[PDB]
Write a protein that binds this ligand. Structure first.
Ligand SMILES: Nc1ncnc2c1ncn2[C@@H]1O[C@H](COP(=O)(O)OP(=O)(O)OP(=O)(O)O)[C@@H](O)[C@H]1O
Ligand SMILES: Nc1ncnc2c1ncn2[C@@H]1O[C@H](COP(=O)(O)OP(=O)(O)OP(=O)(O)O)[C@@H](O)[C@H]1O
Ligand SMILES: Nc1ncnc2c1ncn2[C@@H]1O[C@H](COP(=O)(O)OP(=O)(O)O)[C@@H](O)[C@H]1O
Lengths: 56, 247, 278, 240, 401
């Protein structure tokens, strides 16, 4: 969780907290994939220019 | 509360900053002087002694403000250097203008006026230095003066300024004689005072520094005692202490 | 009929029965500190007839000072594992807002515990906050900590309620420590915990790596005799990370390059600096 | 510190045992005694001593305040406590803290109540109070008024003679050999804190134990003195 | 209505020394107290007629059981079935008639009833919170004014405020001036505010009320101000009287916001106290005296005309008041001719009466230390040094001024 502002050096020490994973930066293509995933459970014509929407 | 700015006045007419400076003078090495008609003596405690320090200088708390005067300082080092330089400048300016040595009181009052001015304006903080002056002049023979951070000054027959000044002055007032010191007794009294007030025992010669101003053939002589003289003096004092034992 | 006693220290006796399970030899290197703390605590709690024969009034206060990660909490854990007293640490630094000054609330209980079963011991670090030096006495809500420290001092010295209830302080860099809670009769034994030095890094390495796959090609001597200052927590972290690096590549036995990588990773100094401050 | 003992005895035992002397004198007997030692050496140990030969109900409060905490009774230290003490007609109370409960918040309410209760205005007598603390100056002036507190006693660090005496006192059980010189030990440990003498003795005993002997030597005591003292230094702040 | 204090056991012992008059005076007092004892010892002995061998009372005994419960008398019903509730809110409409006077029926006044049938017993109990009834005092501590000395202005002011009103209102009546009600005594500690309070308490024709400032911190939320309201009600009931509050700087101080949010709630007590002191309605005939060491810290709302009509300062005696206190204290003790009280008085400044008491006591103690009942000047020379050691002040203002 990124919520805790204070970070404990003892925790990040090997063992307790083995390693830290940085949430990747969306590339606007993962955004397209997310839109497709959420577009799934949606009723629509089908002629969706998903790339246009994500660029919008 | 009513602090920070030198200028503000406490509702009881107290300038707290200058009082803080006066108090803080107490965190300074012991220094004292004795009139001792036919001469005058200054002594100080060379605190902060370490094996590695070199001590190539000629004294550290004693300065020659002039061919006829000397002074000793206690407080911030930077301010000490500033004030010593200013004093030398003042003395030389007067000598140039009138072609005669500056009387001691005039030099003291000039420097004290500078200090007051600093306590008078809000731009700058008061000087955190207090000092003693010993000199001779035709007008009033020998003289000893003391100057404080607040800007006020006085003249004394004997006085100590820094560190345990209270005990030193108590002993002096209860032991000093008026018009009978003749120097040598003054040296003995000064050594006794230093011994009692100083924390260290046996008064290692390196701990203390001594200077004496006298007259000879119409010229002043301001000589700082070397190690051998101080060793002899402290040896004599210790012998006298032992003599007083069992009696 | 009067029923048996109730209430229990911390979770229970000896902070429950969950001993830390650490052996003095299991944690090697601080031989001197081990001996001093042992003489301080174990001997009086154990046979003290020799102490009486000398007639020494065995001390009850000792503190260990050293950087944060040079063997401390582990030493107290080992003492807990290999003692017989009702060691109730239960001293979570408690600023609190309602119950202020639980010092007597605890020590008395422990003393009540001490006479209930046997003399107990206490231990804790991170008491540096409660150290302070008084100073102002007027600013509200700031003197509560001073009240707590005074209650602690009174309880520690207090009266003849001795029951050889020993106390251990592991919060150090003692400058904020009140001279009141620093004096003979007060915490008496001051024991230093320096950075694991050469000939000690080897002992710690051997002790930690005792149970390990031990590729048999990595020479711990290289790190033992190598320069640079490294504390025990760092050495344990180095071993842990070397093991993780080995397991990452599905390597069952840690190999030398894994140890090298772990050593490089753990050594990061400031890791930012700013190229000034030199 | 015989002088302090004599003074405390005068102010405590005499009024509660010889009221006739005071009433004949025509001066109200003292009530309040303050003990303020900068290091604190001896302070309530004297307290425990007087407690032993109390011959009267010795009350004592030392745990900060007690239950002066979240609500449930405001200023419970008082009223009930003093009526209890007065119930046992002759008695003396001990406030080992005398740094809490009053130096100038909501805490000081109880201090004001205590000051009023100890002061006059329907207050009785036959009770006495001794207060132990360090740096009395911080203490509120009201508590320092002569009426509430009468005698003030400082416990200065023992001199060479006092240091020697306390050392002898704490060395009675020690199996000191023939050759040790307590005079020297007192001499080369100036600025003692009283408790420091007991500390040096105990550590010397530990030294003897480590070698597994039953004898202490001048060398052991010198090592003890060295161990007890702690020095501090740091360079480049040597200005002024 | 009610009455006050009943101490004052002949304040005329005026030799004040070992003289046969005080032997004669006190034995007269012994004679009248033994006879008044003997007057009540045989008073019941005479006239065997012990309530006519008993009558009527038996009815009240039998009608009401041995234990009487108490409750709050709610809405009254003419048929004697007024509703009453027990401590647990056990409201019950219940009959109420025996040989019981049915005229003191009010909502909210405690009533007594039977344990079993809950019938109203009779004695509508007339009592208040014991936390206040304890405060009532009827024992004057010591002398009224002679002991005190030098505060002619302060004693005059307090007299005008309190004593004169309840002695001769002729001036007030004809001129239409209402006497001042509230007085706040303030000054450095030990100046003797408490001394003057006791002084007036010794010569108060009316009942005295004593309260410490830090006495209204009732643990339970709320409550509290109810305490002070009931206190004022009680004081008003018991005829004219004076309520004295010592160390008032514990319930009202600058009325500052909750800040940290702890909700100390003492502010609520202060507001209720202020309302009762002066707000709406009328206070009645009740005087108020307040004592504190610091007055500025008090919030202005409490301190204003109509609540504290007088602010009386008690300064350090300089020379004359100092001499008065000094020789007043020394009077009751043997002293030597060589003693020079004026010498010590002049020698020392900034000295308060408490210090005078302390120094005289210490001088006597030192003299006893020397084994001499008589004192000497040197005794005082040592005493004033010993006592005045705790005080250490003065900034390095020794040269510039
Ligand atoms: N000269 C001495 N005589 C007796 N006990 C002494 C002396 N010097 C030190 N001590 C010891 O020091 C302790 C004094 O306890 P005391 O009640 O004075 O504590 P305190 O006032 O809280 O402060 P401190 O810890 O400095 O004594 C006791 O253990 C006592 O034996
Ligand atoms: N001028 C005086 N004449 C006679 N007795 C005096 C005088 N001044 C002080 N005293 C005595 O010394 C005592 C010390 O002062 P006191 O205890 O009254 O303190 P206070 O601060 O004025 O009042 P409180 O104790 O309620 O705060 C007085 O109560 C009184 O007994
Ligand atoms: N026997 C040992 N020898 C050396 N290092 C050890 C030993 N046992 C544990 N360590 C390492 O040092 C730590 C000891 O606690 P430490 O970090 O000193 O406590 P703290 O830093 O909280 O005061 C262990 O957690 C581990 O990282």
């Amino acid at each position: 969780t990124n919520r805790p502002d204070t970070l404990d050096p003892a925790l990040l020490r090997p063992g307790r907290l083995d390693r830290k994973i940085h949430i990747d930066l969306p590339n606007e293509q993962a955004r397209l994939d997310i839109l497709k995933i959420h577009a799934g459970p949606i009723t629509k014509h089908g002629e969706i220019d998903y790339e246009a929407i994500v660029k919008l | 509360r009513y602090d920070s700015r030198t200028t503000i006045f406490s509702p009881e007419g107290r300038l707290y900053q200058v009082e803080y400076a006066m108090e803080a003078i107490g965190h300074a090495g012991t220094c004292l002087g004795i009139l001792a008609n036919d001469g005058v003596l200054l002594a100080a405690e060379r605190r902060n002694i370490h094996k590695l320090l070199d001590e190539v200088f000629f004294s550290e708390k004693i300065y020659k403000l002039n061919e006829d005067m000397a002074c000793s300082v206690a407080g911030i080092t930077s301010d000490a250097n500033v004030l010593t330089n200013e004093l030398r400048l003042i003395a030389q300016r007067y000598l140039l203008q009138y072609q005669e040595p500056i009387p001691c009181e005039q030099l003291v009052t000039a420097l004290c006026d500078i200090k007051q001015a600093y306590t008078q304006f809000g731009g700058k903080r008061p000087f955190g230095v207090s000092l003693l002056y010993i000199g001779w002049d035709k007008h009033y023979g020998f003289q000893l003066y003391q100057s404080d951070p607040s800007g006020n000054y006085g003249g004394w027959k004997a006085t100590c300024i820094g560190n345990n000044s209270a005990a030193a002055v108590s002993m002096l007032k209860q032991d000093y004689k008026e018009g009978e010191m003749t120097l040598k007794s003054a040296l003995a009294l000064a050594i006794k005072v230093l011994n009692k007030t100083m924390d260290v025992s046996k008064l290692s010669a390196e701990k203390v520094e001594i200077a004496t101003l006298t007259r000879e053939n119409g010229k002043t002589v301001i000589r700082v005692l070397k190690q051998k003289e101080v060793e002899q003096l402290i040896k004599k004092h210790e012998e006298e202490e032992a003599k007083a034992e069992r009696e | 009929d009067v029923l048996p006693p109730e209430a229990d220290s911390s979770i229970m006796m000896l902070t429950s029965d969950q001993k830390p399970d650490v052996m003095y030899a299991d944690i090697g290197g601080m031989d001197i500190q081990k001996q001093e703390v042992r003489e301080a605590v174990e001997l009086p709690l154990t046979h003290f007839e020799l102490y009486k024969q000398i007639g020494i009034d065995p001390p009850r206060g000792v503190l260990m000072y050293g950087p944060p990660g040079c063997g401390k909490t582990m030493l107290a854990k080992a003492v807990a594992h290999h003692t017989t007293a009702a060691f109730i640490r239960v001293v979570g630094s408690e600023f609190v807002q309602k119950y202020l000054g639980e010092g007597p609330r605890m020590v008395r209980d422990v003393f009540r515990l001490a006479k209930e079963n046997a003399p107990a011991i206490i231990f804790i670090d991170e008491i540096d906050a409660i150290a302070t030096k008084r100073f102002d006495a007027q600013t509200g809500a700031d003197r509560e900590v001073q009240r707590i420290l005074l209650e602690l001092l009174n309880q520690m010295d207090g009266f003849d309620q001795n029951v050889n209830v020993k106390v251990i302080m592991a919060t150090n860099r003692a400058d904020t420590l009140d001279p009141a809670l620093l004096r003979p009769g007060r915490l008496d034994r001051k024991i230093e915990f320096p950075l694991p030095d050469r000939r000690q890094k080897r002992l710690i390495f051997s002790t930690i790596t005792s149970k390990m796959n031990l590729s048999e090609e990595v020479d711990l001597e290289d790190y033992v005799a190598r320069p640079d200052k490294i504390s025990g927590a760092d050495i344990n972290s180095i071993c842990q990370e070397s093991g993780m690096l080995a397991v990452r590549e599905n390597r069952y036995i840690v190999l030398a390059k894994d140890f090298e990588k772990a050593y490089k990773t753990v050594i990061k100094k400031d890791e930012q600096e700013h190229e000034f401050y030199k | 510190l015989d002088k302090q003992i004599k003074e405390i005895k005068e102010v405590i035992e005499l009024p509660v045992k010889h009221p006739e002397l005071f009433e004949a004198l025509g001066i109200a007997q003292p009530k309040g005694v303050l003990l303020y030692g900068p290091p604190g050496t001896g302070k309530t140990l004297l307290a425990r001593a007087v407690a032993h030969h109390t011959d009267c109900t010795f009350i004592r409060v030392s745990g900060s305040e007690l239950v002066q905490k979240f609500i449930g009774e405001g200023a419970r230290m008082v009223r009930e406590l003093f009526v209890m003490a007065r119930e046992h007609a002759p008695s003396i109370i001990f406030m080992d803290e005398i740094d809490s409960i009053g130096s100038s918040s909501e805490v000081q309410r109880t201090m004001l109540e205590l000051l009023n209760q100890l002061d006059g205005f329907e207050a009785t007598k036959n009770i006495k109070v001794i207060m132990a603390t360090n740096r009395i100056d911080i203490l509120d002036s009201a508590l320092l008024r002569p009426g509430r507190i009468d005698r003030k006693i400082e416990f200065p660090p023992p001199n060479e003679e006092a240091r020697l005496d306390i050392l002898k006192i704490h060395s009675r059980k020690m199996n000191l050999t023939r050759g040790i010189n307590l005079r020297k030990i007192a001499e080369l440990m100036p600025g003692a804190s009283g408790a420091e003498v007991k500390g040096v003795c105990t550590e010397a005993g530990m030294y003897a134990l480590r070698e597994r002997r039953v004898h202490v030597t001048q060398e052991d005591f010198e090592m003890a003195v060295a161990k007890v003292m702690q020095k501090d230094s740091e360079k480049n702040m040597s200005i002024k | 209505t009610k009455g006050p204090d009943a101490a004052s056991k002949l304040p005329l012992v005026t030799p004040h020394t070992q003289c046969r008059l005080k032997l004669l005076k006190l034995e007269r007092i012994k004679d009248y107290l033994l006879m008044e004892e003997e007057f009540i010892r045989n008073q019941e002995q005479m006239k065997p007629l012990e309530e006519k061998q008993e009558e009527e009372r038996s009815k009240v005994d039998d009608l009401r059981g041995t234990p009487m419960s108490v409750g709050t008398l709610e809405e009254i019903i003419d048929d004697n079935h007024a509703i009453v509730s027990t401590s647990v809110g056990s409201e019950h409409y219940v009959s109420i008639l025996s040989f019981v006077d049915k005229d003191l029926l009010e909502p909210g006044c405690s009533v007594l009833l039977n344990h079993k049938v809950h019938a109203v017993i009779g004695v509508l109990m007339d009592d208040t919170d014991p936390l206040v009834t304890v405060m009532k005092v009827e024992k004057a501590p010591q002398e009224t004014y002679a002991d005190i000395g030098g505060l002619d202005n302060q004693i005059q002011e307090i007299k005008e405020s309190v004593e004169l009103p309840l002695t001769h209102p002729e001036y007030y009546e004809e001129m239409g001036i209402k006497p001042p009600k509230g007085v706040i005594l303030y000054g450095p500690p030990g100046t003797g505010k408490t001394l003057l309070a006791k002084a007036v308490a010794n010569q108060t024709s009316a009942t005295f009320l004593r309260v410490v400032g830090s006495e209204l911190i009732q643990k339970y939320l709320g409550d509290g101000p109810k305490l002070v309201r009931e206190l004022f009600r009680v004081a008003e009931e018991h005829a004219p009287s004076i309520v004295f509050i010592d160390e008032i700087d514990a319930i009202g101080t600058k009325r500052y916001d909750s800040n940290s949010g702890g909700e100390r709630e003492i502010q609520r007590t202060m507001l209720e106290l202020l309302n009762q002191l002066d707000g709406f309605d009328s206070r009645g005939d009740v005087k108020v005296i307040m004592a504190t060491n610091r007055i500025e810290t008090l919030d202005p709302a409490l301190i204003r005309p109509g609540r504290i009509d007088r602010k009386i300062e008690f300064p350090l005696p300089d020379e004359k008041t100092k001499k008065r206190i000094f020789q007043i204290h020394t009077s009751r003790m043997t002293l030597a001719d060589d003693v020079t009280l004026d010498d010590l008085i002049m020698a020392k400044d900034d000295l308060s009466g408490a210090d005078i008491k302390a120094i005289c006591t210490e001088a006597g103690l030192m003299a006893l230390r020397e084994r001499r009942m008589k004192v000497t000047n040197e005794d005082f020379k040592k005493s004033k040094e010993n006592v005045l050691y705790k005080k250490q002040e003065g900034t390095p203002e020794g040269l510039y001024l």
